[PDB]
Each structure stands twice: as C-alpha cells, then as structure tokens.
Design a protein around this ligand. Structure first.
Ligand SMILES: NC(=O)c1ccc[n+]([C@@H]2O[C@H](COP(=O)([O-])OP(=O)(O)OC[C@H]3O[C@@H](n4cnc5c(N)ncnc54)[C@H](O)[C@@H]3O)[C@@H](O)[C@H]2O)c1
Ligand SMILES: NC(=O)c1ccc[n+]([C@@H]2O[C@H](COP(=O)([O-])OP(=O)(O)OC[C@H]3O[C@@H](n4cnc5c(N)ncnc54)[C@H](O)[C@@H]3O)[C@@H](O)[C@H]2O)c1
Ligand SMILES: NC(=O)c1ccc[n+]([C@@H]2O[C@H](COP(=O)([O-])OP(=O)(O)OC[C@H]3O[C@@H](n4cnc5c(N)ncnc54)[C@H](O)[C@@H]3O)[C@@H](O)[C@H]2O)c1
Ligand SMILES: NC(=O)c1ccc[n+]([C@@H]2O[C@H](COP(=O)([O-])OP(=O)(O)OC[C@H]3O[C@@H](n4cnc5c(N)ncnc54)[C@H](O)[C@@H]3O)[C@@H](O)[C@H]2O)c1
Lengths: 339, 337, 337, 339
C-alpha cells in the first residue's frame, strides 16, 4: 500500500529490508534503495551477510538499476545529496534514513524537499529537533500531522527504555547509573587509525573500548519522569553483534527482593510488552540472542537487589536485528495512522 | 643529515617513525608529518599502539602544529592535497608516501610540486616506477630516480628467498598463497568496497583477495617474469603473515639441502634480511622482527625431487617499515645533488 | 531400520545428530548417546549452538537418563570406558565413534565388546582400518567390515576434486596447504600440549600444524600414493576451512578447462558432494553446506601449462557430519546380517 | 636467600616466574617447577608467550630435568600428587600453588606433608581455615607462625579491594553492586563443549559470557567493614587479557562531586598505595594496560557520581601480570617476615 525508500544500505538499512521481507503483510513496500555502489554492491551484500548469513530468497539483478527479491523489483539509485533523489518522481511515502549523517532537522528534511512525505531516522536526532519514539513505551504519542520527521532512538535506548519503564512504573526509580558491554560497530577503526574519538580509533577487534553514550540520558525523551536521573558509559568488546546492558538504579519503593523484581517484567512481558520485553531464565550467552525479535531480554539469574533499595538488572538485545525490527514497527505505525 | 617528511601517518607511517627512532646514527631526519589528523591524533597513536604496544619514549603534544619525541620536535600539518604541503619551504629532500592513494606518477608527483625532492612510495608503484626490494636489487637504485616504490609487504618477503632458490636450483614456474593478517583496507563489518571480498567481515572470515607480489617479484627479479603468481587469504589477525611458496626447480633437490642454502645466504649476503627458525613457533612469536623474511625450516618440504614448498613468516608492518627505513637509509647514502 | 549409538556427543557428535534430523526417511535411528556429560549438558548444547545457532526443534530434558527431540526419545549414558556401555543390551547395530580417542583397532573395538555390531569412526583410522570417503570409493565398502573410518574433514574435501583432476589430467605430484578453522584440539591459551604449536593461543595465531589428509588421500585414491603431501594453518575462525592444492599434471591444461571438468563432475557423478561457486564469497558464506567440497572457480589458476592450483572451501563440521551420516546412511543399505 | 617452588606452570605460574626474574633482588629463589610436561613443554612456554611475547633471556635445556634462565638452573619435576614431590629433599621454603585445584586446607597442605615450609595459593581458598591477603590493603596482618597457608585472593578482588578501601575509608561505603568485563580464561571452553557451567561451556572467543563471581563478596575477607555489602557478576568478552571493573556503590558521605572522588585515589595513589593504585587521565583502551604493575588503575574520565550519594568507578587491571606481580610481593613478604 505505502511506498518506502531506504536511504543507506548498510547493516541497519539492510537489516531493515530483511526484517520487512519475511513479514506478515506490512503496509510498507520498499521500492528503492540508495546504496552508493550500484546494483552489484547493493545486491551481493543483501544476499550474503556475515552476521545474518546468506539471505533465503532469489535475489537477481534486473536492469542496470533494479534488482529483485523473489520477483518483486526494487529500483536502486545512488547520490550523497538527497536533494537529487527521485523521491517525488517515484512518490516515496516513507524514508528510512539509515546513514547516521542526516540526523538533524535541516538534514533529514532534505528528503522532504526531494519529494518525500515522511522521514524516519534510524538513530537519535542531531539536536533538539524531531521527536523520539520507542515502540512499547510511547508509540501512541505519534499521530499524523504531528511532525513529519521522527527518530526511533538508539539501539541501546530502545533496549533500556522498555524495561526501564516497568521498573519506575511499578517500583519507582529514584535514579541510577548504567553500563553497556556493546558489540563493536562500523564507527570504530579496524586497526589503530585517526578518528575524532581516540577510543574508537583503536582496533575495534582487540580492545575493550570505553566510549561515551547519550543512550542513557535520551531515555527521558520517551520517559520524561526520569529526565536527568539515568546516565552511563559503554564498553566496546570484540563481538560483531548482540549486546548487554548493566542497569543499577537504587529504587524508591520498599526494598523488594530479587525474583519479584523479575516477576514484574515477566508480568509486563507477556502482557503490555508482549513482543518487546521478555525474560529468559535459561543461562545462555550473547550468541544465543542473534536474530532476537525482542527489544530487550532480561537474564533472570543475573538480576539482584543489594541493599533493599539498590536494584541491578542485565538485559540482552541484538543491536542490529532487534532495532531494525522496531524500526519496521515504527514505520508500520506511520502507515496504520495514515489518512 | 637528509631531511625527511612522512606523509600518511598511518600504520606504516608510524611503524616507520618508530622503526627509525631505534636506529643508531641515522642519515635520515624526520621533520614534518602530514596526516588528516590533528596534533592530538598524531601524538596519542604514536605513543599508544595496539600492536607495537606503548612506545618507549616521551611523546608530548608540543605546539599547535607539532609534537615532541624525546625532545626532537616535529611539525604536523594536514592538507588532503599534497601540492599545498610546504615541502619546498622546509627543504624536504625525501617524502615517505604512506597514504595508499598517491601510488602513481601523477599522484606521487604532487609532492615534487610542493617542493619535495624525492618520493619513496611505501607500496608497490602503479605504472612505470622504479621498484626496489632491499636485498634483492637495491644496487639498481641511482640518485637519478625521483620516485621509487619499496614494493609490498609480501613481495619484500617472498623476493629474498626466491632469489636464493632460482639463483641455486632454477625456478621453472610456481604459485604461492599468502595467509595474511588483515589491514586497514578491509571493512570491519560487511560494508561496501570495490572488492566484494575485502568488503566482508574481515575478523570473521578468511578473505581471499588478490595480491600483486606474485608478478611484482618479477619486477625486482627480472628472471622470473611470468613464472610466479598467487592469491592471498586475509585471516583474523592484526599482524604478521605467512607465505606458502611452491616452485618447481630444474636441479633435483631435497628437503634439508634447500633449507641449508637459505641459511648460508642468511648468514652471509642476506644477513639482516632473510633468516631461518627451527624452534616451532607461531604468528605472534614474530612481532617486531627486523628481518624481511623468516623461513620455518621444519615446514619446508620437497616432492618428486623438483617441487619445492617453503613457508615463510614476516611482520607485514614492522619488518616492512624496517625495510622502508633501510631504503631511505640508502637514498641518504649515494646522494649527490 | 538401523539402530544407532552416538558415542562422543562433541562437535561432530551433535553436528551429526542434527545433520540427521534434517534428512527425510533416514535408514538411521539414534537411540542412545554417550558422553562424559549429564543429560543437562546433552540437552543444552544440542539446542544452543554457537556455530549452527539455536536448533529448530523442541529439545527438553525428558528423563534422568534421556532427552527428547520433537518427541523422539533418546537415552544418555556416561561411561569413560566403552566396554560398559549397554550396546549389546540395546542391540546397537552401529556406533558413531566421535570422541577422538578410540581411533585404533584396540580402542574402537571396546564398542564391539559392549555388544555393538559396527563402529564408524568419525576420523581417520589409525593403523589397518577401512577408510572410505563418500564419493571417492564408498563402493569399496562391504557389510563385512566391522570398523570403518570416514577419513578427516580435510581429506573428505581434498579427495573428491583430486579424483577429478588425476582422472582427467593425471596428477604427477603435488603439495597442498589447508588454512583451517581451529578445533577443540587447540589450547585456548598457551598451555601444555604434545604439539607445541597446537599448544599456542589458537585465537591469536596462525598455527601451523600437520595433517594426514595429505597421505590419507592415497588411502582412498590408491593411485596417488606418495604423490601428495602438505601442512595446515590453524587460523582464528570457529568453522569452515579452505584447502590450497597444487598438483602438476601430465596433460597440459588451462585455467577454465580445469574448472569446467570440476563443474561437469559436480553436475553428474559428484552431484551432492563437489560443487563450484563463482560468486566471490568468504568463509562465513559457507556455513551449513551439505556438500563436502566447493571450488572457488575465480581463484583457480594454472602455470607453465602443467602446474595447477585449486582453492576449495568446506565446512569442516557440518559438511563432514553430512558425510558421516551419508556413510552410516550407506551401512544401513547393503546390510545383510 | 629463600628457596621457592612453583607448582603449576601455566599463565599465572609462568607469569610469576617472569615477574620474579627481572626484579630488584627478591629474597625468593625459584629452584623447581612442577609442569606436567617436562623440560621441553615447560621451557618452550616460558620462552615464547602469546600474551607476554618472547621472554628476553637465554633459556636453555640442561640435563633431562633442569633448564636454566641465564645460567641459573631450575630443576623441574612432574607429578599430579604433591605427596610424591621432593619438597623436603630440595628443602623448599615457599610453594606457589597455581593450579586452581589445591585450594582447600587438606589439599594445599599436601605440600607441607611433602616437606614444604609455607604454601601460597594463587586463588581464593575454598576452606575458611586459610587467610586471604591483598597487598596494599591488609598485608601487615601476616606474620610468621600465623598459618602456613595463605591465599593472594582473586585477580578481580585484588583489583577491587585496594580502591574499594580508599572509597569507604574516605567517603564511607553504604553498599553497592559491581560488574567486571573480564578477558576470557583457561577455564572456558574454546568451542561449545561440555562444562559444569553452561556459560563457560560456550566459545570463550565469540560470546559475552555471564558467570558468577565471589570476587565481590571476598572483598570482606580483607575489608571486614564491608562484609555482605558488595556483590556482582562478571562478563567474559573475546579479549585474551586485561580487564575492567564497574563498581556502583552509593556512598554514605555528603554527595561529593566526581573529580574529587578521583582526587582521593590520586592522593592515596601516590601515597599509601604507591605501587598498587594509580589513576590514568589519558583515554586509552585495554591493550594499553598490558604488563601493568598496578593492582588497579582508575579511568579518571570514566568516574561519575549520579545522585550525590551514588558513585560509579571503573578500574583497569592486567589479570595475568598484575596479580602475578602481587603474588611475588606477597611471597616477598613471607621472606621479609621470616626468622
Ligand atoms: N547496525 C547496528 O548495529 C545499528 C544499531 C542501531 C542503529 N544503528 C544506526 O544506523 C546508522 C547507520 O550505521 P550502519 O551501522 O548502518 O553503518 P553502515 O556504514 O553499514 O551504513 C551506512 C550506509 O549509508 C550510506 N551513506 C553514507 N553516507 C551517505 C550519504 N551522504 N548519502 C547517502 N547514503 C549514505 C552508505 O553508503 C551505507 O550504505 C548509524 O547512525 C547507527 O547508529 C545501527
Ligand atoms: N600495513 C601493511 O601491512 C603494509 C605494508 C606494506 C604496504 N603497505 C602500504 O602502506 C601504506 C599506508 O597504509 P597503512 O598500512 O599505513 O594504513 P593506514 O590506512 O593506517 O595508512 C593511511 C594513512 O594515510 C593518511 N592519509 C590519507 N590520505 C592522506 C593525504 N592526502 N595526506 C596525508 N595523509 C593522508 C590516512 O589518514 C591514514 O592515517 C599503503 O600504501 C599500503 O599499501 C601496508
Ligand atoms: N570438527 C571437525 O573439524 C572434525 C571433523 C572431522 C574429524 N574430526 C575429529 O573427530 C573427533 C571428534 O571430535 P569432535 O569434532 O566431535 O569434537 P570434541 O572434541 O568436542 O568431541 C569429543 C567429545 O567426546 C567426548 N568423549 C571423550 N571421551 C569419551 C568417552 N570415553 N566416552 C564418552 N564420551 C567421550 C568428549 O567429552 C567430547 O564431548 C576429533 O578427533 C576430531 O579431530 C573433527
Ligand atoms: N593468569 C591468569 O589468567 C590468572 C589470573 C589470576 C589468577 N589465576 C588463577 O591461577 C590458577 C591457575 O590457572 P591458570 O589460569 O594459570 O591456568 P593454567 O591451566 O594455564 O595453569 C594450570 C597449571 O597447573 C598445572 N596443574 C593442573 N593440575 C595439576 C595438578 N593436579 N598437579 C600439578 N600441576 C597441575 C597445569 O599443568 C598447568 O601448568 C587458577 O585458579 C586461576 O584462577 C590465573
């Protein structure tokens, strides 16, 4: 029904397209991709993925600019300047801006100027421009006519928010810190080379790398009540995908026990957050969460309250797939709330 | 004496600078460094290396356009287009082109324009350019050459002991495969690239890519033209690589005779370049190795009397740099005007 | 129709069980599993695999001495000494010996004593034992053999396409080197081992180790006795490996002719075993590949008309398992007593 | 002056020997090693180390059981049963039990029965009979005649304790949780295989692996005042060496600021803990702490107080080298307090 464009055919963008393909019957319909590499470079990488594994479906190169996933064509253009994009010509309704460059009002909006109707950023805004939504938390807050540029937050923030809510909304979060052992990412250097952040400039694959992260503060953007109460760092570790968060907020409520904190999740898990949150009691490891549709999974056996007031949780989330899956839900929303 | 300028303070840029600091009475003298990165960037990474480890020396950020190394001060500039670099203003006699882009007549030349006198390309030259592999034909050099390439990290390994073979058993023909550590060129995560192989994971695969070192040998060992050729495999390791040569010689020979020959040369002519090692080691055991190539004796094996296979280790970063320095070390000697 | 017992529920043990579950109408039937690990251990790891990923099937810990897979129940026992296993009591017709210790007449035999009828060794046999490589000589098998080995993961790759070569160009002699993923055998951190190489880091080095697949080829291709031989390089990857063969044939030939021959066989006789791939891929792109060997066409190259080099990928875990099953799949057929 | 034996020539034991060699003039004198592999397997690995790099010194194989490090001989025996050991024959004064098996009174004591004078365990004791020391904290508490079996604690506990002290001793620790992104270790499987802990049984090299750790509780063993107030988990990440701790204790004192918390360390660092603690202000990454003589290093820029009461610290420690270095100090003690 609704025509979708994907600006940025990399991990998240490709993880998107994949997520979307094998789906119920999304109102969405990818008809164009903007990968600065042609049909070749854009096809190959959709078919063979080192982290998701060979894509299960006939992917052929039709035209000199039109590959096809099981017959369904997908026109592919390439230009760094959105302004030159045929959004209007093709009549693009939604644009999944997944480049990490156009994250401010002026920028991401260049897509509207090209002829796009609505723009979804697969990352946190570039400033105070644009709302930030997190399916499971405050998706309702989105309604047509209300800004034509939205941000599906961060991979981390989209993993935290959900279970951060259930914590405050059913135990009252005084305030707390947090850390996130995170799988390295494209923004990191492969080997020690120049980079604006002397931490990311180090061999992404052979170091535990500390790097700031707003993912903590931004929780507020969706959960105002916490505004300026959370916060933390992040640690990059030699693991191509799937990460974990280590939240430590000393609660306001009584001094509940461990396994009950859990139950809250478990409750809100099979209830309001059925599809977002979840609790896995079986002791596994990162690799067991590859391709996990849940925006956040708590390691039951890891949760532990210390001094009655201080609660500690640990959650599992596939940063590529998970987020991409929400990004398809948030784009699924736009369409369900469209004239 | 000879004023030098490092352009492209990357892995070979730094591995070089440091390789240099360790030499005694070096005809070379670094004075300027040009890299897209600020003085901060140059300092930090020269001091803290994830492969060579923290640098033993005092490295501070002295200046807005300079850094200090044990007192010796060096200027750090940053122009993505060479022509601008004040090579002429600083009287740059030699430029160590380690950027990976300026590998052709046209490109490397922009350095000459900037006022530089010579340009040593820390990689194979593209097109018609003098290629020299210290130990394999450095006598071919003449102060006349304004632009020379010190070949690749692989060629600089494979060459030395190939010379030894041919020059003793006669290489008829032969392929080779280099199991190579990954490099800045590969993508950390499946991302676009002009080599859909190199475009893959890098740390999660054995990435077959092609290498010139195959034909490049011939570049410096004229005799082997079109006799050698191979591929390469990029495996999950940040440094030190191994080559698997397989030549067919004329003179029937056996296992230990081959190795012997190697040792002999390694103790005489190639002393400092080639070397043998019997102690059964592994990659990591070959970091910071001043030599270009190291034969794993216990691995060498012959078939049907004429098919020889030789495994050889080499630190694609350090060992190469040490060569780069040795080449520039040469340009300083046999330098007239 | 044929009762089976998996002894050594390790990587090949599980990679097999699962390889099996996917086959349609399998003459094989697993009933008992013996591994040093408890029912917990057997369940978990059959369900959650770090290389094959979570198993698509319902796997619960049904029993104190059993586990359930989609309902099919299986017993899990644990005796470090085979003789004790109730093979006779359960009427075990075949035992899949994947422990890595019982690879000799004496050892594998303890299974026969326990009451088992046959013992398929998921590795090369040590001493005088029937070695068969599905696709290379499975017709040599006869229900008479009580103990057979399905060769190594490497041999099972190298063999198929070697047959193709010799059987068409005549292999005179030739070496080979297999860049191989690491295995349970290596030490995770510099620790004691009988192979001071394998004893090293494993994940931080290219570990040269030796392989039998070299001479083992001859085991199944009698013609090449003493014509092949190579080494192996253990690089930081948990699975999928590549072989770099280099044979000298009699009949002068060229690049695409070779590849052609391969394809032909891959489409006819070896259909299901060998296969070619032009799409420039990498390691990871070859997980779960039912075939034993896959030629990387674009890499194949010839020298001086008679020296042929062929690169070939293979999933040392899955692809092998699929062979193991195919072999056991055979024992079930052509089974009289 | 004092004869030392090393039971268990692996990482920690070898890291020991190395630590000891290039030293001022330790009263210690390694004269025997117990590596179940002979002079070959024991030599090779002392000379070529994947994590420390080729050992700088002539290491030759004399006798069939007596290698030598620069001339100085070292007799080498091998037997899993300490009872058969020639401790008495050789007259061994100290034994560095670094196997991780003999960690209880009955066990580690088998060395005394063989003829050993004193035994130091390079790990936490499983008994309760044995004293746990942590150089920098409570080393004084050790005096001859007082137990002939001591434990130099854990790698983690020996990194925590030090700066945990300064925290409570100059700010008052109410209680808090902690996490530790830890470099994988020998006890982990290389590839998914049977192991009593279904977490450690997963590919040490390709997973973030959560595994319990007492290192937290054991802090008390040296710092009673905290008994039952700390606690936490641990995460194994694909990094052969050098780890980091993430402590989150909400303080008792006022509601001090970040950079002052630091100053305490900085103060106690160049003062009483000169050689144990230290603070590095320059943003580095794991690999930059290899061969670090400090039992603990705090990442200045990472520290951060949240709600006035909740303090968060991050420390760097080389688990192999560091610990081994303390283990040589703790063995250095025994000798300085010997009749
Ligand atoms: N995959 C993940 O783990 C993950 C997690 C959550 C969110 N994200 C976010 O996704 C964003 C994209 O990063 P990535 O991981 O996909 O990296 P990537 O490099 O794989 O993807 C970038 C893509 O954008 C294209 N591109 C770059 N600049 C462009 C321009 N000016 N015009 C048009 N196309 C352009 C590139 O060609 C490439 O296809 C980042 O902001 C990241 O934070 C990624
Ligand atoms: N590391 C090896 O194994 C090895 C050895 C032999 C050959 N080489 C050659 O070394 C050279 C450098 O590559 P590397 O390995 O150092 O990796 P690298 O990518 O870290 O080095 C390139 C550096 O050049 C800088 N640079 C790029 N354009 C520049 C410009 N216009 N002006 C100034 N600086 C610029 C970049 O900022 C970067 O720091 C290449 O030519 C490569 O082929 C690599
Ligand atoms: N994975 C490969 O690449 C591959 C393929 C071909 C051949 N092989 C060979 O096959 C053999 C099987 O090893 P694997 O690959 O399955 O890995 P593995 O080492 O995990 O398998 C061995 C398993 O057998 C169990 N075991 C050992 N002794 C036992 C006993 N007495 N009783 C019961 N169980 C016992 C161990 O606990 C372990 O789970 C190895 O020798 C290997 O070299 C491996
Ligand atoms: N270096 C580190 O990573 C580190 C950190 C801090 C403390 N530790 C502790 O040190 C201990 C040693 O383990 P490791 O990590 O050095 O592993 P390791 O396997 O490398 O060391 C164990 C050594 O003890 C020997 N050994 C084992 N059982 C024996 C027995 N019964 N009799 C005699 N010798 C025996 C082994 O042969 C080997 O040489 C563990 O408890 C570990 O927690 C190690």
């Amino acid at each position: 029904k609704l025509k979708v464009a994907i600006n940025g055919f990399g991990r998240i963008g490709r993880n998107f397209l994949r997520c979307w393909h094998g789906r119920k019957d999304s109102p969405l319909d990818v008809v164009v991709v903007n990968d600065s590499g042609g049909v070749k470079s854009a096809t190959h990488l959709l078919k063979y993925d080192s982290i998701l594994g060979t894509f299960k479906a006939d992917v052929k190169i039709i035209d000199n600019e039109t590959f096809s996933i099981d017959g369904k064509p997908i026109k592919v253009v390439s230009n760094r300047d959105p302004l030159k994009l045929p959004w209007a010509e093709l009549g693009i309704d939604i644009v999944i801006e997944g480049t990490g460059v156009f994250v401010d009002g002026p920028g991401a909006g260049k897509h509207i100027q090209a002829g796009a109707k609505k723009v979804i950023i697969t990352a946190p805004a570039k400033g105070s421009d644009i709302p930030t939504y997190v399916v499971g938390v405050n998706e309702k807050d989105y309604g047509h006519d209300v800004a034509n540029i939205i941000s599906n937050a961060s991979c981390t923030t989209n993993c935290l928010a959900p279970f951060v809510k259930v914590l405050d909304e059913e135990l009252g979060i005084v305030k707390g810190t947090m850390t996130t052992t995170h799988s390295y990412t494209g923004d990191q250097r492969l080997l020690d080379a120049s980079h604006r952040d002397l931490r990311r400039a180090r061999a992404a694959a052979l170091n535990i790398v500390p790097t700031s992260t707003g993912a903590a503060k931004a929780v507020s953007l969706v959960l105002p009540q916490l505004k300026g109460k959370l916060n933390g760092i992040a640690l990059r570790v030699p693991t191509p995908n799937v990460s974990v968060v280590d939240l430590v907020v000393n609660i306001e409520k009584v001094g509940v026990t461990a396994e009950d904190v859990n139950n809250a999740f478990r409750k809100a898990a099979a209830g309001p957050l059925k599809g977002v949150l979840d609790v896995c009691d079986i002791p596994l490891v990162s690799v067991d969460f590859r391709c996990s549709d849940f925006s956040s999974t708590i390691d039951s056996s890891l949760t532990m309250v210390m001094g009655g007031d201080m609660v500690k949780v640990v959650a599992w989330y596939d940063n590529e797939w998970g987020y991409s899956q929400r990004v398809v839900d948030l784009a699924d929303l736009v369409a369900n709330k469209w004239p | 004496k000879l004023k030098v300028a490092i352009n492209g303070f990357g892995r070979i840029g730094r591995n070089f600078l440091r390789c240099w600091h360790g030499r005694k009475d070096s005809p070379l003298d670094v004075v300027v460094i040009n890299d897209t990165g600020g003085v901060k960037q140059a300092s930090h990474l020269l001091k803290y290396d994830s492969i060579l480890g923290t640098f033993d020396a005092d490295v501070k950020t002295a200046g807005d356009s300079a850094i200090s190394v044990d007192g010796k001060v060096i200027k750090v500039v940053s122009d993505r287009n060479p022509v601008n670099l004040p090579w002429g203003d600083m009287g740059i006699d030699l430029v160590i082109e380690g950027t990976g882009v300026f590998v052709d007549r046209d490109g490397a030349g922009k350095h000459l324009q900037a006022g530089a006198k010579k340009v040593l390309i820390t990689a194979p030259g593209k097109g018609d350019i003098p290629t020299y592999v210290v130990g394999v034909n450095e006598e071919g050099y003449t102060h006349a050459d304004t632009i020379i390439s010190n070949a690749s990290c692989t060629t600089n390994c494979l060459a030395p002991f190939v010379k030894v073979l041919d020059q003793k058993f006669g290489i008829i023909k032969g392929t080779m495969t280099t199991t190579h550590s990954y490099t800045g060129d590969q993508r950390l995560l499946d991302a676009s690239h002009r080599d859909l192989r190199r475009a893959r994971a890098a740390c999660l695969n054995i990435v077959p890519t092609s290498t010139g070192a195959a034909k490049a040998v011939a570049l410096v060992l004229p005799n082997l033209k079109g006799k050698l050729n191979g591929i390469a495999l990029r495996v999950p390791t940040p440094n030190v690589s191994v080559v698997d040569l397989v030549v067919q010689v004329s003179k029937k020979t056996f296992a230990e005779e081959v190795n012997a020959a190697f040792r002999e040369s390694a103790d005489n002519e190639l002393k400092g370049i080639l070397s043998v090692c019997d102690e059964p080691l592994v990659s990591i055991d070959f970091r910071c190795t001043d030599v270009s190539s190291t034969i794993d004796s216990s691995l060498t094996m012959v078939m049907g009397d004429d098919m020889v296979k030789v495994i050889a280790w080499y630190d694609n970063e350090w060992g190469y740099s040490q060569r780069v320095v040795d080449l520039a070390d040469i340009v300083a000697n046999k330098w007239q005007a």
